[PDB]
Amino acid sequence: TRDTQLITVDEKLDITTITGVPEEHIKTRKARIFVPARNNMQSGVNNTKKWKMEFDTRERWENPLMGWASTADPLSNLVLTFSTKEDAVAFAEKNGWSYDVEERKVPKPKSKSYGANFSWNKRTRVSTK
Amino acid sequence: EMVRKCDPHIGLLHRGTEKLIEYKTYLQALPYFDRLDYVSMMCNEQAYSLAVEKLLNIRPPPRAQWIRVLFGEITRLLNHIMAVTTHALDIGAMTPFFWMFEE
Amino acid sequence: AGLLKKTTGLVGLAVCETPHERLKILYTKILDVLGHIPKNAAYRKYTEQITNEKLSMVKAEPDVKKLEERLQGGQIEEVILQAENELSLARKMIQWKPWEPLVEEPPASQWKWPI
Amino acid sequence: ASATRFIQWLRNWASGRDLQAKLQLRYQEISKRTQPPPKLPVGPSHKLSNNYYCTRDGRREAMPPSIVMSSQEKKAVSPAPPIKRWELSQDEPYL
Amino acid sequence: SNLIEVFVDGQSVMVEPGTTVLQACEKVGMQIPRFCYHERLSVAGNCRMCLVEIEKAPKVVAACAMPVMKGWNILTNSEKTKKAREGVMEFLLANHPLDCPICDQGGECDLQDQSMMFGSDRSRFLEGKRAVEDKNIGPLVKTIMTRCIQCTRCIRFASEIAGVDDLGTTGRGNDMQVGTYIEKMFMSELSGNIIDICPVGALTSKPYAFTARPWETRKTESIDVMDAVGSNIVVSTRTGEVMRILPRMHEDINEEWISDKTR
Amino acid sequence: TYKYVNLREPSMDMKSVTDRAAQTLLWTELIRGLGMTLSYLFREPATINYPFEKGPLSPRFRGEHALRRYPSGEERCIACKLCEAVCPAQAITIEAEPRADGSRRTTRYDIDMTKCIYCGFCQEACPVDAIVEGPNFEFSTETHEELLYNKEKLLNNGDKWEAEIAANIQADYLYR
Amino acid sequence: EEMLTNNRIWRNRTVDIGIVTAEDALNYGFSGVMLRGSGIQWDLRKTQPYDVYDQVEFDVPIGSRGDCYDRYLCRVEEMRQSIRIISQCLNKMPPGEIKVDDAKVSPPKRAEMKTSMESLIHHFKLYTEGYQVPPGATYTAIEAPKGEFGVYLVSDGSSRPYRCKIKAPGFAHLAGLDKMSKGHMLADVVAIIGTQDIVFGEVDR
Amino acid sequence: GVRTSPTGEKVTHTGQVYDDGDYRKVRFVGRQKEVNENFAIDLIAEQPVSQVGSRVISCDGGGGALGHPRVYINLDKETKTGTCGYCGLQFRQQHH
Amino acid sequence: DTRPTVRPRNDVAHKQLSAFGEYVAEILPKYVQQVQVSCFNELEICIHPDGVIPVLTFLRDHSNAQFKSLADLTAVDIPTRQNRFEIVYNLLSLRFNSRIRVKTYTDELTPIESSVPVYKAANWYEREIWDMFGVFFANHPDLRRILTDYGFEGHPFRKDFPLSGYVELRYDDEVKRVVAEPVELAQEFRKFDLNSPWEAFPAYRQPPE
Amino acid sequence: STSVKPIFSRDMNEAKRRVRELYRAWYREVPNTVHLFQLDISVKQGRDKVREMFKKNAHITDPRVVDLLVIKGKMELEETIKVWKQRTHVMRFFHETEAPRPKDFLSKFYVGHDP
Numbered sequence A: 001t002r003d004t005q006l007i008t009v010d011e012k013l014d015i016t017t018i019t020g021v022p023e024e025h026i027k028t029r030k031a032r033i034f035v036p037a038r039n040n041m042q043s044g045v046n047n048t049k050k051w052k053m054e055f056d057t058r059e060r061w062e063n064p065l066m067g068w069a070s071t072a073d074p075l076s077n078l079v080l081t082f083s084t085k086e087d088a089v090a091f092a093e094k095n096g097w098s099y100d101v102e103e104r105k106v107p108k109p110k111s112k113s114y115g116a117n118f119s120w121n122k123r124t125r126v127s128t129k
Numbered sequence B: 001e002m003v004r005k006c007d008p009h010i011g012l013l014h015r016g017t018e019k020l021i022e023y024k025t026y027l028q029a030l031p032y033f034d035r036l037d038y039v040s041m042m043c044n045e046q047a048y049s050l051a052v053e054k055l056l057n058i059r060p061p062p063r064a065q066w067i068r069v070l071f072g073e074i075t076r077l078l079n080h081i082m083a084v085t086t087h088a089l090d091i092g093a094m095t096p097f098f099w100m101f102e103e
Numbered sequence C: 001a002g003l004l005k006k007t008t009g010l011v012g013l014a015v016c017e018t019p020h021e022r023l024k025i026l027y028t029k030i031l032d033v034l035g036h037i038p039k040n041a042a043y044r045k046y047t048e049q050i051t052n053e054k055l056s057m058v059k060a061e062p063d064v065k066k067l068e069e070r071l072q073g074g075q076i077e078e079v080i081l082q083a084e085n086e087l088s089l090a091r092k093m094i095q096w097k098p099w100e101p102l103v104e105e106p107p108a109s110q111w112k113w114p115i
Numbered sequence D: 001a002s003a004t005r006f007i008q009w010l011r012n013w014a015s016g017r018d019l020q021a022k023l024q025l026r027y028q029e030i031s032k033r034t035q036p037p038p039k040l041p042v043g044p045s046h047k048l049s050n051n052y053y054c055t056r057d058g059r060r061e062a063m064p065p066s067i068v069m070s071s072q073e074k075k076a077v078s079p080a081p082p083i084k085r086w087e088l089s090q091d092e093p094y095l
Numbered sequence E: 001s002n003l004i005e006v007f008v009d010g011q012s013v014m015v016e017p018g019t020t021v022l023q024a025c026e027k028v029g030m031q032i033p034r035f036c037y038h039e040r041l042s043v044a045g046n047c048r049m050c051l052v053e054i055e056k057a058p059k060v061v062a063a064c065a066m067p068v069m070k071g072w073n074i075l076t077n078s079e080k081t082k083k084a085r086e087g088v089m090e091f092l093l094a095n096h097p098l099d100c101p102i103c104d105q106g107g108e109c110d111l112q113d114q115s116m117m118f119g120s121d122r123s124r125f126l127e128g129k130r131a132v133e134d135k136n137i138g139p140l141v142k143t144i145m146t147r148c149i150q151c152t153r154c155i156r157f158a159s160e161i162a163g164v165d166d167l168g169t170t171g172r173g174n175d176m177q178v179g180t181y182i183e184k185m186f187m188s189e190l191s192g193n194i195i196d197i198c199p200v201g202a203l204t205s206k207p208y209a210f211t212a213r214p215w216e217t218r219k220t221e222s223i224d225v226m227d228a229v230g231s232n233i234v235v236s237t238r239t240g241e242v243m244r245i246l247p248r249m250h251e252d253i254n255e256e257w258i259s260d261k262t263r
Numbered sequence F: 001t002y003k004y005v006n007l008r009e010p011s012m013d014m015k016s017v018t019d020r021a022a023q024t025l026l027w028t029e030l031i032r033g034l035g036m037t038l039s040y041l042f043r044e045p046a047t048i049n050y051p052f053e054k055g056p057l058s059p060r061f062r063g064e065h066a067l068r069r070y071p072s073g074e075e076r077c078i079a080c081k082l083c084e085a086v087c088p089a090q091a092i093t094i095e096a097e098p099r100a101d102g103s104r105r106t107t108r109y110d111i112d113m114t115k116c117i118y119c120g121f122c123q124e125a126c127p128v129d130a131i132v133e134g135p136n137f138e139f140s141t142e143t144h145e146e147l148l149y150n151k152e153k154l155l156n157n158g159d160k161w162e163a164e165i166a167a168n169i170q171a172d173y174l175y176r
Numbered sequence G: 001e002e003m004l005t006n007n008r009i010w011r012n013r014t015v016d017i018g019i020v021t022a023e024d025a026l027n028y029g030f031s032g033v034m035l036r037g038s039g040i041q042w043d044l045r046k047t048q049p050y051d052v053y054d055q056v057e058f059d060v061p062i063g064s065r066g067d068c069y070d071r072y073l074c075r076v077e078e079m080r081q082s083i084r085i086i087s088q089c090l091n092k093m094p095p096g097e098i099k100v101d102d103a104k105v106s107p108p109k110r111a112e113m114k115t116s117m118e119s120l121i122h123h124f125k126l127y128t129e130g131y132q133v134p135p136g137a138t139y140t141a142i143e144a145p146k147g148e149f150g151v152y153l154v155s156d157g158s159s160r161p162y163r164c165k166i167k168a169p170g171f172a173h174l175a176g177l178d179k180m181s182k183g184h185m186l187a188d189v190v191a192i193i194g195t196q197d198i199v200f201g202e203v204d205r
Numbered sequence H: 001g002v003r004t005s006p007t008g009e010k011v012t013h014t015g016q017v018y019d020d021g022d023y024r025k026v027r028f029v030g031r032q033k034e035v036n037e038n039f040a041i042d043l044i045a046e047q048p049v050s051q052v053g054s055r056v057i058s059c060d061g062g063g064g065a066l067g068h069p070r071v072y073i074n075l076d077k078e079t080k081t082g083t084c085g086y087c088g089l090q091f092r093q094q095h096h
Numbered sequence I: 001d002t003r004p005t006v007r008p009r010n011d012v013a014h015k016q017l018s019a020f021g022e023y024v025a026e027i028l029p030k031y032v033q034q035v036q037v038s039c040f041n042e043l044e045i046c047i048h049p050d051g052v053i054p055v056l057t058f059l060r061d062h063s064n065a066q067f068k069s070l071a072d073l074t075a076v077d078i079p080t081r082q083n084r085f086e087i088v089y090n091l092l093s094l095r096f097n098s099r100i101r102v103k104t105y106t107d108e109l110t111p112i113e114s115s116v117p118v119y120k121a122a123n124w125y126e127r128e129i130w131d132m133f134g135v136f137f138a139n140h141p142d143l144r145r146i147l148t149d150y151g152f153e154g155h156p157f158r159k160d161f162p163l164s165g166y167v168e169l170r171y172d173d174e175v176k177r178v179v180a181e182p183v184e185l186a187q188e189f190r191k192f193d194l195n196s197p198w199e200a201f202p203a204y205r206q207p208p209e
Numbered sequence J: 001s002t003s004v005k006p007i008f009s010r011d012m013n014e015a016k017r018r019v020r021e022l023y024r025a026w027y028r029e030v031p032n033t034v035h036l037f038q039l040d041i042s043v044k045q046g047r048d049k050v051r052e053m054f055k056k057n058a059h060i061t062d063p064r065v066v067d068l069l070v071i072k073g074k075m076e077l078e079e080t081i082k083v084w085k086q087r088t089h090v091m092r093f094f095h096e097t098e099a100p101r102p103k104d105f106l107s108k109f110y111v112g113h114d115p
Ligand SMILES: CCCCCCCCCCCCCCCCCC(=O)OC[C@H](COP(=O)([O-])OCC[N+](C)(C)C)OC(=O)CCCCCCCCCCCCCCCCC
Pocket: F024, F025, F026, F027, F030, F031, G008
C-alpha cells in the first residue's frame, strides 16, 4: 500500500541534538506533568480537563533600577498542553527532559439528598435554611 | 552590471509577530496588524477583523461596514502614493514624492 | 468561423490559428489515455464525462466566440491550455494509481480539533 | 490664494490647468475645529422587551465542521459554477 | 443492577437512584450553572441558577435538588433552559453593586463568569440599587455585604463543616441580610474557608486585600507544613513574591479546606 | 467591470505621424514636464514654521501618558489593573495595597515608555478615566532611563496637563 | 501623470522591464496588480466581496504587456477608482451604531459601563480575558493595496489565538524577483523592486 | 504631606525613601528625586462630609459619565460615615 | 438571516463545497483520509503525507478543479499529536471562484515531498516552514533558513521554544564586535492565566475522558 | 510500528559516510574561513572547534537524526563559504565574552541556587 521503501529504526526517539536547546536547559530541568488543580475561588471545572507540562521555578531578582522582577530562565513562562498523560510523557522523553508525573485527582462521586436536611432522627437535619 | 542571479535575504525585519500573537488576546493582537504593511494600516486591520468576525459568527453593523470601506479606500490612496512615488524616487524622479506626500 | 482575434489579453498566451482542430486533437488524446485507467476508477468516469461534453460543443459550434460562451473557460486559448493540462494529468494518474485504497489510516486523534 | 493676478496667470499657463479652482492648501472651507456635541444612536439590541440574548447569540450558533467523508451514474461537479466573464466598462473602456 | 437509565441531551447515562439532575449531567461532561450548590455542603436550592428543562415537562426543575427519574431526558441547552438562566442572572445583577474594579474577586468571580456565559449582555433595570451595611466578623475575613447574593454557602459551611452556628439570615424579602446580627467575630480554625466558598466578593481575605489580580498570579502546587496533616495547597506568586495560599483538592487529606494558620 | 490602461492603437494619418515626429525631435512632452514644475515654483509652499507653528491635531490625539485626579485632588486610579491586563506591550507594572485610610490605591504605577506602543487601550479600559494619553508629544530625552515613568512622574504629568486633558475629554467623551 | 505617463525617460525605465507571463504569475503566487498587469481579470473586491464592496461601482484596471509600465498605469488608475468609491461612500453613509450590539464581543459605551451592572461586567471581562472564539480555522483574505492579504487564523476555544499565519502578498512577489530580473541590468532590478510594491513589515512579519 | 528623611531625601506619598547606606541614592547626585507634592490622602481628608436625609445615597464621582461607576452607600451606621469606595467622598445621614 | 448581529449562512455554497469534497475523495481514495466543510463554508481535505504531489497536481490540473494559485502554505505545531506538525495548503481557483484547504501531517524526522514542482510559490513557504518549524522538505531546490539569523539554533515557532529564546545580542567593546550571550531579561514576561473555568461553547464539548 | 520513512541514509553505515564527507568539507574550509573573515584565531583552533562540534553528537544511533545533523551542518557550511555569515557569526562558536561558569558543586553553591 504505502509504496515508499521504509526503513527500520529500533531505538528510542531522541531529538535533543536537533532542537537547538542549550545543554544547560535539558539535563538540569525537571518537567512537571500534571492536571491543574481547580482554582478554589471558583466552581468552574473547565481548566481541569487537560494535562500541562511546566518546568521547575528558578531565581527571580529585583531590577536595580525600577524594582521589576528579572529572570535568567528562558523556560519560566513555558506551559504545554497535552490531551493525555501518555502524550505528555512521550513529549518529555523525546526532548531529554526528566519529568515527574502526578496522576489526575478527580472528585469522588457524592450522595446528595435535599431530603436529608429534614431528617427525623439523624444529625443531617439543619438548624437554618 | 547584468544581473545573473538575485538571492533576496529577508528576516532583517523578522520580529516574531506570529509567535507573539499566540500570547495575546484577539484584541491585544490587533495593533500587531497595523505594523505588518505599515503603509496600509487600516486594510491590515480589516483582514484580521473579517477573520475573527467569521469565527465569531457575528456581523459588524452597516454603518461600520461603510466606514471600513471608506477608510479602506483612503488607505489605498496612502499606499499607492507611497508605492508610485517611491518607485519613481528610486528611478530618479524625486519631485512627485513631495507633491503627493503633502496629500 | 469569425475573424481572428489579434490578442488574447493574457501575456505569454499566443493566439491559436486553428482553435477547433487543436481542441479536437487534445480531447481525443485525453480519451485515449483514459482508456488505460481501470474502467471503475472515478477519475476515468468523471474525466471522460466532462471531456465528451466539451468535445461535443467543439463539434457543434463552428464560431469561436459562440463556442467560448458554451465552454465557459475564458478565451479559446485558455481552453486549449486546460486541455493540455488535463492530458498531462491523466498521463500521471496512471503512474500514481489514486484509485487504489487508502495507503494508511491516520493515528487515532490526528484530525481531532480542539485537542 | 494671495498670489497676484499675473502670477496666477503664469502658473495656470505653465501647467495647463486652472489651479485656483482646486488649491492644495486648505483655507476657511475646512470644518471648524470646535464642533457641537453629538448624540449618537443606539443599536438594534437596545430594547426593553423581546430581546433575550439566546435569540441573537451569534457565537453559540457556530458548529463544528460537518464531516462529508471519513476513513475512520453520479455526475461531475466543480467547486462552484464557473465565474461569469467580466464586462468592459461603459464609463471609460479605454484609458 | 440497580442503576437507572437517564438521558442527557438524548445521550444515555446510567446513574444510581437518588442521583440529582446536576450529578447526572456531570457524568457526560456538562456542568450546570450554580451559585448556592456546593458538593460538600447541604443542598439549599435558592439561587435558581441551575434550573434546567426536562423534556415533556412544562416546569423547569432545580438541577441541584431534583433527583433524576428513569427515562428522563435532560435538556441542558434548550431555549427554555437558556431563558431561565438569563432571567435568574438578571435578578442577581439587579441590586448587585458596580464594584468590579474595586472588588478583589474580579477575574475569578463566578457571578462575572456565569454572567458572560449564561446571562444576557445588557441591563434593563432602571431603579435604584440596594445597599447594606458591612459587618465586622474578625481580622481575617473582610465583609462587604452589598455584594452578597444570599446564597447561604457561608451559613451552611459554618454550621456543617466548622461546627459554629454564628452566621444566619436576619430580615425578610429583599431586606434579608446574612451576618451575625450581634457584633461577633467568626473566629475558628476553619474560618478562612468562607472566602473560597463565597462565589462573590462579599467575603474576601483582609491580608490579601487589593494586592493582586487573579490572572497575574502563578500557581505553584505545593504542600503545607504548618501541621502534620499535610494539606495540599496552591501558593500564588507574583513577580517573585508570595501573595496568598489557596487550598488544593485532595479527597483523602483535606478535600478543599485548609486551616487558618495554613492560609 | 474592467478597463484597459494601455490598449490603444495610434493613428497613422500623415498629420498624426508628423505630430509624433515633432514630439520626438522637439521634445514637446519633455517641455511639458518642465512646465508643471515651473508652476509649483510659483505656488505658496506647504511648509509650516515649526516650532513657532504646530501641525493640527485633534482631541483624540494619543500622546504622553498622565494620571488624573478628581476635582477634590483624590487620585482617580483605584488599582483595578485593567490597563495592565489589556496593555499589548506589557508596558504597565502595578502594585497596590490598602492605603493608610483604607482606600484601594497603588504603590507602584510604572509605564515603560520604550515598551509602550501608544495605542490608547489603557484609557479605553480604565473605568474611572484615571490613565489617559495626553496631547503632549514633545518629550524626547537624552537618556534611556528618563523614559521609564513611575507613579510620581505620571502624577506630575497629570497635574501639569490637566487643564488641557480635561477639555479634550469634554470634547470627545460623547463619542466614547 | 504629466510628469511620468508620457515621459519618454520614464517609459524607457519601465516599458518591457520585468515582464511576467499570466501563467507564471499564477503559479508563483502573485496577486493584485501583479496579476492584473499581465492581463488576468481578478480582484477580490468583485469576485469575493467583503463588507459593502458589492454596493459600490468601480472598474478594475487591466494591463496588456505585463511590464512595469502597465503596472504603473494600473496603480495610477486604481487611485482614480478609489476617489470614485469615496464619493459613493460619502453619499451612502447610513446612520446607526458603529460596533456590533453584542456586549460579549464589543465593549459597551462608557456611559453604560458606569451605570449598568451587566455592562461593567462585560467591560471588565472584555479587557482582561477577552472574548472566547469558537474553535475552528479560517483563511480570510482581502484585496489589500499591495495584493491579496489574508490570515490563516486558528482558534482553540479560548481568548488567545492558537495560530495566526499571515499571508503577506509581498512574500510571494519578492520570491519572484529572481525570475523577473532575468536578462536585465542593475538599474532595472531597482525598478522591479518598486513595481512589486514591497514592504518588509509584512514579508518578514 | 511631604516630609524629608533624616538624611534629607524626600518621602513619597507611598512612604518610599532610601536608607542612609543604600548605594541607590547615587542616582540622585547631580539630579533630583521626582516627588508629587499633592498627597491625595491629605486632599481627600480636606473635603467636608456631606449631610443627607436618606438611608442610602449614590455617588458617581461628579461629572456624570466623566466620573466613576455609580455606587450606592449605606448610611445606617451612626458611629462612622459612609465612604465612596471609588473617590473617597464621605456622606452622613442627617440626625440618624 | 434577519438578525442584525448574527452572520448569515450561505447554504448554496455549503452544498456545493460538500458535493465537491466527495468528488475529490472519490477520485483520490488512496490519499484522502477525511473531508469536512466548516459553518462558514471552507472546504478542508485531509490527506496522507504521501499524497501531497498527486493531490495537489489533481487540484491544479483537473478541468473541474483548476486551483492555479497557492494562496499560502504553513504549518501548525500540536505537541500532543504523535505527528505534531500539520502542513496546510490554501489553494485558490480563479476559474471557479472557490477556495480549498489541503492538510497533511509529519513529525520531527519524517520528510514531506516538496511541492515546488506543482507550485513555484512553495519555494519560500517551505523554506519558512523548515526555518520556523524544522520540517524537512525532500527534493527542495535549495532549503535553508529564510527568516532567522545566520547560525540561529532551534525553531522559534515550535510550541516548546521559549518566547524570548535562549540567546540575545549586544555590542562588546573588548572584542569590537556584536556578541551572543544567554538571555537575561530586566523584566520577565508576565504570564497571564486568562482562561475562564466555565465552558463557553457547548457545541464543541468533547466526550468525557 | 518501528517502520519509518528515511531522509537520506537507510542505516548508520550509510549515514556515517555522509558524516565523514561533511567533516572533510569543514576541515578543508577552515583555512579559507580564517583568511576571508580575518579571524585572529589559528587554523588549529578552528579545526579543533570543528572536531569539538562533531564529537558533541558522537552518541547518536538513529540514522534520521544523523541525516538532519548533516543537513544542518551543510547549511552552516554554505553560509560560511558564501560569506553570508559575518565575523560575529563565525566567532559565536568560541564564546569569548562569556565568563567561565562554575562546574563543581561548591562553586555552584556559592554563587546561586541553580543545580
Ligand atoms: C525642409 C528641409 C529638410 C531639412 C530641414 C530639417 C530641419 C529640422 C532639423 C532637425 C531638428 C532636430 C532637433 C534636434 C533633435 C535631437 C534630439 C533627438 O534626437 O530626439 C530623439 C531623442 C530620443 O528620442 P526617443 O527616446 O523617443 O527614441 C528615438 C528613436 N527611436 C524612437 C527609434 C528609438 O530625444 C532626446 O534627445 C531626449 C532628450 C533627453 C532629455 C533632456 C531633458 C530635456 C531638456 C529640454 C530643454 C532643452 C533646452 C535646449 C535649449 C538650450 C539652449 C542653450
